[PDB]
Every structure is written in C-alpha cells, then in structure tokens.
C-alpha cells in the first residue's frame, strides 16, 4: 500500500537574475553523465515546485564553512566527512540520524585530540539520495537502482522506473533530516564530555578495545582538565555539522539554487558542500560546469586513472580566484596504488600556487578489508609527510565500514595525526 500526496502547485517567487541564468543555461548545455531518464516536462514541473521551497541551508553557513575550509587548506585544521554510503527514505528516521550525528561527533573529538587542531565536521546527510551505476541492467535483470531521488530499491519493474516526483520527496526528507541535525547539534548530546563517554563505552565493550584504551583515557583526562580549568559546555562551540552529498541529479541541484552575495552569486542551498564523483567529472561536462558557477565549496573524486595534468585542470576550472579551501581533491586510489600515484598529482597541483584541501577517501578504491582501508589512509599520510604538504582530511562511508569500525579508524588516524 502507498498513499498519494498531492504536490501543492504554489506561486512562484521572482526568477533568478537573467545574467546568472544565462551563465547557468550555458553550463547545463554541456553533456551530463548518469542522469535520470524521466521526461523533461515532468522534470520541469518538479523543479518549479522546488524553486520556491524553503532552502535546506543558508548562504551565511556556506560562507562560514568556506572560512573554516580555508584553515584546513592552510594546514591549520582537519576535515572529517562521513555518514551513510546512501541515505534511504525508509531509514530517514530519528534513531538513524541521531546515530550518525553521534558517530561523527565521536570521531571528531578523537581526531581533534590527535590533530591538535580544529576538525570541520561534514555529514553525508540530508541529500545523499542518488548514485551512478556502471550498468543500466542489474543481476536480477531489472533496471538498476539509482537511489531514492531517482527510483525504488524494491526488486520490481514499477519501482525501478525513474520517477520525477522523487525530487520533491527527496527535498522533504532532506529538510526534515536537516531540521533534526540542527536540533541535535544545539542540544546537550553534542557536549564534548557526553560525546566522549560514548567513546569510553566503545573501548569498554569492543573486542579491540584494549588497542584504543590508552588514547581514550588520555582524551578523557584532557576533557577533565578543560573542566577543571573552568571551561564549561556553556561557552564552547555549539557543535556545527555541515551537510553534503554528491551533486549527481542536476534537476535537483539546479532547482535548489538561490541568489546571495560582494557580487550576486548562485549558492546551491540543497547542501553546504557537494562533490562530483568519479563517473561524472568529465572536464567539459555539465557537473564540472555547474560546480564552476556555484559559490559553495566543492570536491572532486580523483581515482587511479587521474593524471597530474587533468588534476591541474580541475584546479584552474574550479578555483579560478585562488580561494583556499574552495576546492577539495579527494584521493581514492586503492591502498596498493596511493603511494605511487598520488605524489606526482600533489606535486603538480602544489606548483600551481593554489591551496586545495587534500582529502583521503580510503573506501572507493579498495589483505582484509579494514586493513586495506587503514593502509590507504596510512599511505596517504606517508605521501604528504614526504612532500611536506598537508594531509587535510578523510572521507568515510558508514554502512564498507560499520560504526564500530569507523570509530576504530578515527583512533588510528588520530595516531597518524600525531
């Protein structure tokens, strides 16, 4: 059983300025890989609804993130990006969102201690509802599942058809999630000492706990020292978790564009930051052109086929104003390749004079699974130490790694940061 919810067809706000729309329209005339195959008129109808809904994020938050990412780029902070590999509407619930917020804050406190510098927390949340696929036919002979913004997971033909109403369903889920993320990060749950009590319960009940007990205890003593010196929860933070997803479905991202400033600029207000995946980063494609036109900080996934030359081209396209932290280059080479392939990319990019964030994705390129994940982050750190560059952050998927494992990874990366 399903229920139909009428999409309230409501009055338009003023259009975006004609000049910015001309630029956007030129950008989106470029070919776009991995796009849903729904009819353009239905897509247009759904975009028109989304053009007037309240945004998920607001410009001042994106400007603030940019400033914090500038510090990461300059070697004075570390980026933690993490969360669900794929969000689903079915699991977009309070316990699931709370679990992810908790895990991110737990990772961040360990990483802050190890890094001795602030950690910017970016969730894969409130929009991670679309993925590419290598084949349009899966192992059951069905059209491939492309995420809940596009079609249904259920193994049947009707569910797998590309349904443009899922654009509006994605927005509703995204804004409801983000509302809860904001509520949670402003509560006492997000208190540093409450967050770390969970880390100590992890050490106490995990089979691998003895490996992390010394560091968990050291962190606890740091927090108690803070408190003994008169530092209260009352003053700190309050916790800031930013929203990100892969900018994949351009119908959604373009509908969520809003105007803000010194000059008028388009911000993508579906998220704070977005990235462009390995299969949609064509240099002359629509995704890269779109990232070019928006003010948001952006990331590009770089795999083993990456050349240092193409990497410099992303820098020149995506950071033309030389704004530190505006562009993040996300390495996902595989633990066996990262030590060979990343260094010449890093050297060439560093010689441009631009300040990107170097972030490690140890999942997408990868004896045992966890050991390979850890080995790629290790290899990533080794490359940056040798080159004198900043190992700027990690990008991890929780499902891949479960929550307990991602927490272990934070402890091991904390040790690497020392």
């Amino acid at each position: 059983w399903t229920v139909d919810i009428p999409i309230d067809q409501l009055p338009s706000l003023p259009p975006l300025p004609t000049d910015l729309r001309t630029r956007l329209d030129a950008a989106l005339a470029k070919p776009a890989a991995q796009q849903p195959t729904w009819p353009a008129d239905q897509a247009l109808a759904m975009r028109t609804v989304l053009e007037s809904v309240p945004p998920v994020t607001v410009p001042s938050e994106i400007v603030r993130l940019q400033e914090q990412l500038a510090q990461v780029a300059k070697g004075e902070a570390f980026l933690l990006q993490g969360g669900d590999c794929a969000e689903t509407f079915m699991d977009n619930t309070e316990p699931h969102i709370r679990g992810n917020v908790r895990a991110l804050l737990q990772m961040a406190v360990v990483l802050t201690y190890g890094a001795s510098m602030p950690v910017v927390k970016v969730a894969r949340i409130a929009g991670q509802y679309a993925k590419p696929r290598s084949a349009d036919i899966d192992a059951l002979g069905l059209r491939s599942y492309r995420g809940d913004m596009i079609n249904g997971f259920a193994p049947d033909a009707a569910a797998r058809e590309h349904d443009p109403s899922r654009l509006v369903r994605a927005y509703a889920n995204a804004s409801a999630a983000m509302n809860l993320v904001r509520a949670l990060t402003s509560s006492g749950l997000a208190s540093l000492h409450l967050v770390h009590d969970w880390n100590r319960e992890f050490v106490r009940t995990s089979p691998a706990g003895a490996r992390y007990e010394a560091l968990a205890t050291e962190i606890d003593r740091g927090l108690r020292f803070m408190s003994a010196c008169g530092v209260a929860d009352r003053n700190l933070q309050t916790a800031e978790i930013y929203a990100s997803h892969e900018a994949l479905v351009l119908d959604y991202e373009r509908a969520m564009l809003r105007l803000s400033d010194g000059e008028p600029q388009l911000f993508d207000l579906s998220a704070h930051t977005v990235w462009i995946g390995e299969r949609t980063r064509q240099i002359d494609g629509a995704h890269i052109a779109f990232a070019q036109v928006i003010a948001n900080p952006v990331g590009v996934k770089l795999g083993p086929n990456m050349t240092p030359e193409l990497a410099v081209e992303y820098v020149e396209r995506l950071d033309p104003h030389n704004k530190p932290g505006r562009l993040t280059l996300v390495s996902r080479m595989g633990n066996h390749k990262v030590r060979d392939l990343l260094p010449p990319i890093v050297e060439k990019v560093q010689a441009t004079g631009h300040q990107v964030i170097w972030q490690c994705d140890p999942m997408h390129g990868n004896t045992r699974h966890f050991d390979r994940i850890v080995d790629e982050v290790q290899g990533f750190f080794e490359v940056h130490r040798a080159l004198g560059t900043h190992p700027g952050g990690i990008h991890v998927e929780i499902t891949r790694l479960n929550t307990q494992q991602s927490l272990e990874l934070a402890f091991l990366v904390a040790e690497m940061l020392r």
Binding site: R211, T367, R368, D371, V374, Q378
Partner: protein, 72 residues
C-alpha cells in the same frame, strides 16, 4: 638485584623483536601486502594481558618499535 642482568637481556630481546618485526613487514610488502595488519596487533596485545592492565601498553610499545609510528 639480579636485575641489571635481567634488564640487559630484555633489552637484547626487545631490540631483536624490532629487527624481526621489520623483516616481516618488508616480506609482506614485497609479496604485495599491507605493513600493518590489525588482527596481528590484537594478538600481540592479548599475549601480554597476563602482566595486568600494563600489558597492552607494553604490547603497543613493542608494536611501535616493530612497525614504526602510524602516519610516518
């Protein structure tokens, strides 16, 4: 005070374990494997738990001498 002799011995054995541990790391990597392996570090730690709560600290210190500091 037997006991500087006992320290002279454990020093020698600790130095040797570092040599052997590095040799294992070069072997696994030369054969296409990862320097660190999580399940083996848990085994070294479980081995020393007879010393009490300080066992794991000794274990982790022996791992540090063997496979170096993480991130370097």
């Amino acid at each position: 005070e037997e006991i500087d002799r006992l320290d002279a011995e454990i020093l020698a054995l600790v130095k040797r374990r570092a040599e052997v541990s590095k040799a294992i790391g070069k072997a696994r990597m030369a054969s296409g494997g990862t320097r660190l392996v999580h399940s083996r570090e848990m085994k070294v730690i479980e081995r020393y738990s007879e010393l009490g709560p300080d066992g794991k600290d000794l274990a982790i210190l022996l791992l540090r001498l063997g496979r170096g500091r993480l991130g370097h």
